Design a protein around this ligand. Structure first.
Ligand code: HEM
Ligand code: HEM
Ligand SMILES: CCN(CCc1ccc(NC(=N)c2cccs2)cc1)Cc1cccc(NC(=N)c2cccs2)c1
Ligand SMILES: CCN(CCc1ccc(NC(=N)c2cccs2)cc1)Cc1cccc(NC(=N)c2cccs2)c1
Ligand SMILES: C[C@H](O)[C@H](O)[C@H]1CNc2nc(N)[nH]c(=O)c2N1
Ligand SMILES: C[C@H](O)[C@H](O)[C@H]1CNc2nc(N)[nH]c(=O)c2N1
Ligand SMILES: [Br-]
Ligand SMILES: [Br-]
Ligand SMILES: [Zn+2]
Lengths: 407, 411
């Protein structure tokens, strides 16, 4: 019930107690482990509200103070009366930072406390949402010196008035199914690209077309908007040894910004909460570029490198993978856009885990996601045992809005 | 209840009913997942249910379920248990049993091969010399001059837990490790403790970087004894690279037969505490883990210096570059010397075909993702994109404590 995690490379043992706060469920049982599965009223509200306010007042060392009790009473009255409640700004910021803190799939959490929070709970229209988003994009990009931020739109009410950003990220490239049977651009986004097209977006039909924003305020039909191109920092992909690399015509965007998740603070649901930090190199170089169902470029790169593609045992895929990833890192660095390599990031995350064990009594962590998708065992996180469990405040998945929305 | 797993590259969705037969516990609850934790005498009482269930499975597999032959076996095992407190497996049931423990091994990527396993029955063995003899035959049969064949050798089962058969070595063939006075290690650091026990026990150590350890063998609960495997029986492969001629000069080699000797085989409640098994290597076991773990041979820096890579910053991916070259070298060397080896692309693809087949014919395939995904190039192997259900079936291979931790010394 008090649990140990061993690092097998260093022999460091940490004891976890934080897990006994865990509220939500895992998907696992005594009989079956689901560790590798991607997707495992008033009466409900006050327990959640109290639990949250309890940890908040404890975090500022006012647990059991009149001010703590007072607020608990105030929120309680508000629920009884209104059937919801409003977070004070301080609680909103704390809620947000802690949802990041608690994200067991995020390797980048050593940074969790420095999050910039933009309160957009006063927003009412998709145009308003567009303005808030552009401000977020500009603030976060910061000419390439990227800064973490989240923008928080109004919370769910009756569920027929949801704020949603339909995009999966604020900045992503379009995907077009072609007569040839194949795909141009990013195949991950073919469906959303079609929803933009049927909405009225004139598509340049290129390999790297920045998608429009499809923004939904107060449960209305969503509206198209183009992000000013001056706000979208992009990096041309070259290699520091291979001259021909640039001829592949590869680029990526500097700002990863997740816009389809749901933020839960003290029972309150924020269905539009775009957040952004910066890239770990492998996301682009391993996953975006090399996934068979993404840009899938390994074949082409291997050719240009003139490697023996006749047998899998030459490790030509492996060779090409490394080079592609050297180039991503090299390009971002050359252009002065913040990026982290998988070595540095996993080293940080070990140091973060340590702090959290010492300061919090633990750190929920999902090994399957935390281990980078290349060179697993030569990064320290591979050798590190991790306990995975669900703490609130949290980010959660929610269905793609077009399966839900009533037009 | 039906459980679905999805492959996110192909959208193939499979359905699992086999987890329904899962008895043992995972280490997880509804509130915690322990999916990355490395390690998460029986009385008459619990023995007969374990026996029955196993014999029910065995007789189902041979399409004799509910037969006269089935019923009589059940009754005979039952009589034998309560009379003697244990029971003896028939040859056919032992064979079926060992094969299933491999089939059920959720951490094993090489399971496509499960039905071709040579079972050697060493239950008539009584002494350490007898064990040495069975193990040589095993090593020679499995080696097969480089055309590796899977085999397991099964020594007598546990009785009162005071007469255990054990192989003290963790693999039959493995290199010594020697902690030096300056705090450095010579040879394989994973094997320092076992190496010191061998020295204590009287092994005169050559003290090089690649000394094949002697066998330390425990028969019948007696103090273990030392034996050297005939060198002519130990197939080894010098490691060279197909383009970098200085690679050979690093002085690396590895042995060709990987043979695990420290696990416990459980069949119908019976515990076989010495059951060495062998197959062949996936290249990354040597190239990634044995060569490049910081706590093992740790050659990344020396390799990368020799390749004159930029070592001043990790974002040069010097480590990742060196790692690929080492792994090419490992596979090239084995293939050139005609020693069976499999690369991680080829073995993960076979595993996915194995797994789909297992779903269709068997109704499932317990698989531990943390273990199945290779320790380099994860997402360019199809297993990374495969969802897996992990659960424990019997027969099974289990961990057991190192014998020096439990053994009662006689003198
Ligand atoms: C500061 C730089 C950051 C780095 C380098 C970083 C790194 C990562 C990486 C590599 C993933 C895996 C993504 C994937 O494979 O799809 C991830 C997942 C996640 N990150 Fe972080 N992160 C950072 C900042 C943040 C911030 C600011 C938040 C929220 C405020 C956050 C919340 C999450 C969540 C919720 C997931 C899981 C997404 C999912 O389950 O689909 N990240 N992060
Ligand atoms: C045919 C050749 C084989 C290949 C290429 C293969 C591949 C592997 C690999 C790569 C591992 C992970 C080892 C590690 O990281 O420590 C493994 C684990 C395992 N394999 Fe297989 N294997 C093969 C044959 C067999 C045989 C014949 C058995 C037993 C009959 C077996 C049972 C297991 C077990 C019990 C584990 C888990 C070890 C542990 O949990 O510590 N393997 N196998
Ligand atoms: C919610 C989407 N996440 C990725 C979220 C994400 C988080 C982090 C990053 N990278 C970053 N560096 C940051 C982004 C924001 C701050 S840091 C990028 C993306 C991927 C995901 C998770 C679970 C399931 C799926 N499902 C799917 N792949 C599909 C849906 C439909 C067809 S396939 C995708
Ligand atoms: C029981 C030993 N296994 C390795 C077993 C193994 C299985 C398979 C192979 N490789 C093969 N290809 C085959 C061997 C036999 C048939 S196939 C090699 C080894 C490793 C292990 C498992 C669980 C805990 C530990 N604990 C440990 N002591 C450590 C691990 C790392 C640093 S210390 C070790
Ligand atoms: C099936 C498996 O759960 C799935 O492919 C996971 C594995 N690990 C991952 N890890 C990260 N960081 N991101 C991912 O999308 C995935 N996908
Ligand atoms: C902590 C973690 O579970 C541990 O390092 C595991 C990870 N995956 C592994 N996978 C395999 N095949 N072999 C291993 O030794 C390990 N080690
Ligand atoms: Br980071
Ligand atoms: Br195989
Ligand atoms: Zn689990």
């Amino acid at each position: 019930r008090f649990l140990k995690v061993k690092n097998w490379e260093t022999d460091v043992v940490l004891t976890d107690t934080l897990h006994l706060k865990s509220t939500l469920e895992t998907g696992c049982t005594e009989h079956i482990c689901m560790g590798s599965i991607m997707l495992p009223t008033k009466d409900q509200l006050f327990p959640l509200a109290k639990e949250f306010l309890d940890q908040y007042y404890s975090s500022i060392k006012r647990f059991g103070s009149k001010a703590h009790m007072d607020r608990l009473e105030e929120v309680n009255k508000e629920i009884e009366s209104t059937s919801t409640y409003q977070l004070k700004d301080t609680e909103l910021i704390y809620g947000a930072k802690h949802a990041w803190r608690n994200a067991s799939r995020c390797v980048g959490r050593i940074q969790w406390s420095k999050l910039q929070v933009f309160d957009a709970r006063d927003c009412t229209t998709a145009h308003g949402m567009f303005n808030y988003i552009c401000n977020h994009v500009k603030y976060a990009t910061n000419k390439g010196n990227l800064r973490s931020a989240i923008t928080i739109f109004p919370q769910r009410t009756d569920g027929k008035h949801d704020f949603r950003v339909w995009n999966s990220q604020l900045i992503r490239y379009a995907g077009y199914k072609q007569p040839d049977g194949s795909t141009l651009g990013d195949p991950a986004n073919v469906q959303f690209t079609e929803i933009c097209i049927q909405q009225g977006w004139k598509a340049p039909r290129g390999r790297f077309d920045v998608l429009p924003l499809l923004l939904q305020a107060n449960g209305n039909d969503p509206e198209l908007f183009q992000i000013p191109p001056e706000l979208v920092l992009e990096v041309p992909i070259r290699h520091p040894k291979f001259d021909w690399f640039k001829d592949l015509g590869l680029k990526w965007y500097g700002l990863p910004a997740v816009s389809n998740m749901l933020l839960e603070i003290g029972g309150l649901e924020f269905s539009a909460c775009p957040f952004s930090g910066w890239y770990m190199g492998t996301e682009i170089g391993v996953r975006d570029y090399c996934d068979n169902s993404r840009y899938n470029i390994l074949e082409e790169v291997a050719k240009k490198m003139d490697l023996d593609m006749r047998k899998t045992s030459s490790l030509w895929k492996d060779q090409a993978l490394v080079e592609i990833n050297i180039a991503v890192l090299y390009s971002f660095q050359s252009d002065k856009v913040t990026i982290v390599d998988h070595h540095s990031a996993t080293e940080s995350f070990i140091k973060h885990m340590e702090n959290e064990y010492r300061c919090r009594g633990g750190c929920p962590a999902d090994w399957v996601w935390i281990v980078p998708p290349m060179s697993g065992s030569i990064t320290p996180v591979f050798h590190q045992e991790m306990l995975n469990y669900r703490l609130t405040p949290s980010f959660e998945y929610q269905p793609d809005p077009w399966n839900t929305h009533v037009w």
